[PDB]
Amino acid sequence: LTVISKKITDSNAVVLAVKEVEALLSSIDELAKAIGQKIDRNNGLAVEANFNTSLLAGAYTISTLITKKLDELIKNSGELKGEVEKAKNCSEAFTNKLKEKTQELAVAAGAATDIDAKKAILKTNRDKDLGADELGKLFKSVESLSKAAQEASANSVKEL
Amino acid sequence: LTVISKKITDSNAVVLAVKEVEALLSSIDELAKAIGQKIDRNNGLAVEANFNTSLLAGAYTISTLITKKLDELIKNSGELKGEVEKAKNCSEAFTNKLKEKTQELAVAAGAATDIDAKKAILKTNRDKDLGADELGKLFKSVESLSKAAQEASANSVKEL
């Protein structure tokens, strides 16, 4: 069926666009892993602490690409327009909190401390006041948008 | 058709897994954008140079997650097993080159220069000798694996 085909196609590009953002979110989690680290030829990472300024600059730029993908998805989001819009607003709030905190996160001579950096990009830190709180709100909202997997998978399992 | 359904499902999880890696690759490109930068409350990023050690540590950890996703995909890759395996080998070569270059990329007190960092993670730098060459080989090979879009899209456009 032509329309039934076009439906499996629409719900396809929707999960695709959402996974792209999940993957960008996952890379901010890898960045948190590299807080106060250096590449280590035997161990992968060794400790080289209290120099996280540019590392944070890279989480900032990734966060602005996530907002962009959330935003472009809205026009193609269909019934999940609502969930996309609240996903994107979380992403903007994360980016805005990092910008508020340049005193702690944007330190001269590279030297944003590990303690401050974890308060920005480590979902699980106890102190979350430099962006970490918003990062977690953004994961949860994108994880609820990813309910679009059940939506699309049911589209194809319109075999009944 | 049950089997024809199962085929649209298989080719679905294949593009999904590939987009996840494309997105992880794209985040290394954002990291390159933040080479020698800091968050800037008016401008997004301002210049704070020659302190890129941990930033590079984060590209390292992301690169090891890409190999992992390429590797897990092989068992579910079907006819594109061949293209997945050469994608993963590029990813391992990128990660191995970063490890070779700890003298330049893993500098004490945070201070890996912008010049050396671009030779590792900036696809388009002229000098590519600290990983940048392998990063580009990995993009191209994953971009050819993403030919799995035509594969899957033709599966669904088995409407004839």
Tokens of B89: 């080998």
| Alpha helices (H) along chain A | 2-33, 53-74, 81-100, 102-105, 114-121, 132-145, 148-156
Tokens of B32: 């390159």
Nearest to B48 among A16, A34, A54 (CB): A54
In one letter, which amino acid is A56? L
Closest by Cα among A75, A94, A97, A80 to A155: A80
Inspect the interface and report whether the beta carbons of B40 and A98 lie closer than 8 Å.
Answer: no
Nearest to A57 among B5, B15, B34 (CB): B34
| Cβ–Cβ under 8 Å, residues A39 and B106 | yes
- How far apart, in whole angstroms, are the C-alpha atoms of residue A37 and residue B34? 17
Chain A residues with CB under 8 Å of B33 CB are 58, 61
| Alpha helices (H) along B34-147 | 53-74, 81-100, 102-105, 114-121, 132-145
Chain A nearest-CA distance from B134, in A, is: 17
Per DSSP, chain B holds a count of helices (H) and strands (E) of 7, 2
Chain A nearest-CA distance from B4, in A, is: 10
* Experimental technique for the deposited model: X-ray
CA dihedral A36, A106, A56, B92 (to 10 degrees): -70
Chain A residues with CB under 8 Å of B66 CB are none
Data resolution in angstroms: 2.0
